[PDB]
Write a protein that binds this ligand. Structure first.
Ligand SMILES: Nc1ncnc2c1c(-c1ccc(Oc3ccccc3)cc1)cn2C1CCCC1
Length: 433
């Protein structure tokens, strides 16, 4: 069976773990679906085909209101296609940062759902392993949470590219790092999220990946921050049970559901936590957009040169001009079909050198507008500028050498703060331009 025989692409939803996710639509029923497309090139399998197929098969049979429903699985030469239900309420944290009030009641209601889903999957012997806020989609303000990506980390080796690793270190259980992990690792990650929901700061933090992993490996954290004063003791107690180092001594998903805090809270507003979550979230999203911008730029540069050499070879009259059919055949060649023809017609609606420019810009702006937007979001004072402290944090999360970005900053900030355009120049310099 062919994926494109049944489904057509509509919109790109974004980059997710192990692959990009596309909103697709059934050619018969008009049923909208979300599809994760995994490139066999970019991702190494950890298991045999049989084990993966069987997990897929089980997943298709599983049903829980807090777990993303998987419908279908496809495989071709270079790709796996995992087709499941579309959720439209976006990521939990984005909704949370746009709230008047947030209390232990809200956090308890969130955690109940997460725990219920986790409990269900653990009963079925399935571990997430890479569980984080971005894995938590809302179904549609009271709408249920659907956990995405369950079952992937067992069959696929985690990417080494920083673009994909962004923000994972905060949430990963220590025993996962060492290779000996079980279902309790999902409890740890869930413990970290609760900690953030109640303080707006990760319990294990740092200026870069390794500093965070180092705090995680050590296992120590505190409720020292002033804002923990406005938080019940039973919540903090649950965190302690969830953030227990040894997994055998760590509370199960099921027993967490019965905990005093979950029972009781399913009352003042934690304003500081909201402010810290908003700062935290903006930072992670800006760092991420920044890395994605550099990546799209390079990919663009690569494809720009490759497409030019194709359009040059196709110019068998040597004039620099070409017709529509040539462009289509060339664009098809770059990838080596309805989606290409449509894309071509959109560009043409907007001399092959001019075509290359606009076409690539049409990728340069998915990430350019995400970048501008994340920048404006981050600049909550609307000052138009970023401080050196803020830069350090962003590049540190981006894992860009402190001395390297400082260097680049020196060439542009010849005169202690940067605007958006400077920041973007910094990034261009940081990708060989
Ligand atoms: N189904 C979805 N609906 C809405 N958004 C989704 C998804 C999915 C998604 C991803 C993979 C997938 O495939 C599997 C999921 C779980 C287990 C196995 C495969 C199903 C849905 C990701 N996202 C993301 C992309 C970035 C932000 C929102």
């Amino acid at each position: 069976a062919i994926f494109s025989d049944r489904y057509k692409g509509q919109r790109v939803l974004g980059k997710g773990s192990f692959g990009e996710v596309i909103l697709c639509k059934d050619k018969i029923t008009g049923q909208e679906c979300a599809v994760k497309v995994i490139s066999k090139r970019q991702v190494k399998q950890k298991t045999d085909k049989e084990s993966l197929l069987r997990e897929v098969q089980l997943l298709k049979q599983l049903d829980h209101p807090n777990i993303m429903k998987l419908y279908e699985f496809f495989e071709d030469k270079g790709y796996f296609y995992l087709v499941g239900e579309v959720y439209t309420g976006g990521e939990l944290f984005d909704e949370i940062i746009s709230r008047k009030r947030f209390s232990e009641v809200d956090a308890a209601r969130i955690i109940r759902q997460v725990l219920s889903g986790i409990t269900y999957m653990h009963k079925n012997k399935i571990v997430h392993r890479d569980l984080k806020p971005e894995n938590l989609l809302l179904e549609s303000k009271d709408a249920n949470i659907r956990i995405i990506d369950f079952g992937l980390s067992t069959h696929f080796e985690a990417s080494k590219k920083m673009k994909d690793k962004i923000g994972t270190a905060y949430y990963i259980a220590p025993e996962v790092l060492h290779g000996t992990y079980d279902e309790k690792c999902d409890v740890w990650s869930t413990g970290v999220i609760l900690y953030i929901l109640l303080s707006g700061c990760p319990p294990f933090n740092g200026a870069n990946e390794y500093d965070i992993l180092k705090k995680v490996e050590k296992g120590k954290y505190t409720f020292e921050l002033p804002q923990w004063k406005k938080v019940s003791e039973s919540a903090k107690d649950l965190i302690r049970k969830m953030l227990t180092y040894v997994p055998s001594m760590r509370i199960s998903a099921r027993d967490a559901l019965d905990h005093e805090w979950i029972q009781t809270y399913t009352v003042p507003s934690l304003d500081n936590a909201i402010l810290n979550i908003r700062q935290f979230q903006g930072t992670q999203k800006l760092a991420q957009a920044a890395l994605l911008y550099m990546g799209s730029k390079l990919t663009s540069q690569d494809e720009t040169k490759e497409l030019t050499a194709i359009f040059h070879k196709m110019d068998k009259n040597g004039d620099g001009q070409l017709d529509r059919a040539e462009l289509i055949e060339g664009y098809k060649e770059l990838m080596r079909a309805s989606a290409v023809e449509h894309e071509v017609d959109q560009v043409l609606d907007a001399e092959y050198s001019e075509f290359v420019t606009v076409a690539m810009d049409r990728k340069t702006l998915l990430s350019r507008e995400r970048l501008e937007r994340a920048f404006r979001m981050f600049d909550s004072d609307n000052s138009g500028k970023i401080s050196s402290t803020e830069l350090a944090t962003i590049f540190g999360v981006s894992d860009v050498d402190s001395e390297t970005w400082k260097s680049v900053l020196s060439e542009v900030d010849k005169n202690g703060e940067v605007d958006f355009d400077e920041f973007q120049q910094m990034l261009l310099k940081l990708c060989g331009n």
